[PDB]
Inverse folding.
């Protein structure tokens, strides 16, 4: 056996929450380039076979409802599920336009038999919640539920960088590697390469002496029980 | 080139911390079955080629000291480094004979900066740690840098149902898959199978209504940048 069965009418759904502009009450700023990332992720995942839908500047209420509804839809014919969050974030929590929401709440909706139609099926969450805060330098969890996998752009207590023009390093890497091996490599090989790609070569820096040179590395959390290949 | 270079004088070191007995003051009780896990893991990691060392009933200070001194050694001729912790645990903290030490502090000794001798080499941490008693109701972190990988017996929030007669399932599964395929499967493949095995629970037929047939799922946090095979 060893692999998640991909014999279904569709690969499954891909929700992309792209939070760029936030309220005055949150105190957060505009995440430029998040649109270069969202489009790239859209194309990439779409060509992987996902029925991708992109939501912009969502409130915590929506991101929440947005996922409760999805967990409520019937996935009997879906092979898996994937959610992609692009926003500001801190600890186990992402920013909505009007505040902040605990990641655990978003993924809860799928937790175990609370979404039977997706049971035994991989639930993927890709999170790029830049600015955790406290960066790095330079050298040289949630769902307690099987079949969930997380890929964090930053990491628990860091600050991943990008460029307000070219976009995030994680996304560029994620998309590029998927846009070439998405159908011939197991999900963990894809992600491991993204890790190296983000590590090697790129070396985070800034125009401010307080954020100058801060090496970051993505993080993968896996509760998967099989090997995951997209080529159904 | 997409995988860790394993051509060194030796595979590396494997430090096992076997914590069975705890000071009464901690309220933590005897961990019956841990010696069995420690004995299995030691034989298993030895047959893989690691230079295994077993410490038992360590204090927080001892765990810190031995791990620090291990990070201060010269690993220039080792492929990687592995560490296995068998004790009581709670939200990102692990038990010593006399108390509690944060896991990040134990594993930080090996961060690139402070262990130049293991840069770009996989640093593996297998952790089997559980809490100790209190039940719900029902209405209606670690070093984040390259080449680090953690395997937790249970997703931080539950209890890894061991067994005072045959050891823990996680350890029993790990060793099983490792003896059979340890030499030809990549860790993620190995640990993914481990997740599947402990997943094939079939009820942990306990006595108390509170610990009678519940659930547990290991999780893997990978910071790896290449494939890890214990061969070639």
């Amino acid at each position: 056996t060893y692999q998640y069965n991909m014999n279904f009418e569709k690969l499954g759904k891909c929700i992309i929450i792209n939070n760029k502009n936030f309220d005055k009450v949150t105190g957060m700023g505009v995440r430029n380039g998040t649109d270069k990332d969202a489009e790239a992720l859209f194309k990439c995942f779409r060509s992987l076979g996902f029925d991708v839908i992109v939501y912009n500047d969502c409130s915590c209420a929506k991101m929440q409802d947005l996922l409760k509804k999805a967990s409520e839809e019937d996935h009997t014919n879906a092979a898996c599920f994937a959610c992609i969050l692009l926003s500001h974030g801190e600890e186990n929590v992402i920013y909505g336009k009007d505040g902040v929401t605990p990641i655990k709440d978003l993924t809860a909706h799928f937790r175990g038999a609370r979404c039977k139609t997706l049971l035994e099926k991989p639930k993927l969450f890709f999170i790029q919640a830049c600015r955790g805060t406290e960066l790095d330098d330079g050298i040289q969890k949630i769902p307690v539920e099987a079949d969930f996998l997380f890929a964090y752009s930053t990491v628990p207590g860091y600050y991943s960088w990008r460029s307000p023009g070219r976009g995030s390093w994680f996304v560029q890497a994620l998309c590029s590697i998927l846009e070439e091996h998405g159908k011939d490599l197991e999900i963990m090989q894809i992600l491991t390469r993204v890790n190296d790609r983000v590590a090697r070569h790129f070396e985070s820096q800034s125009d401010d002496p307080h954020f100058h040179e801060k090496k970051q590395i993505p993080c993968v959390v896996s509760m998967l029980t099989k090997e995951l290949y997209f080529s159904q």
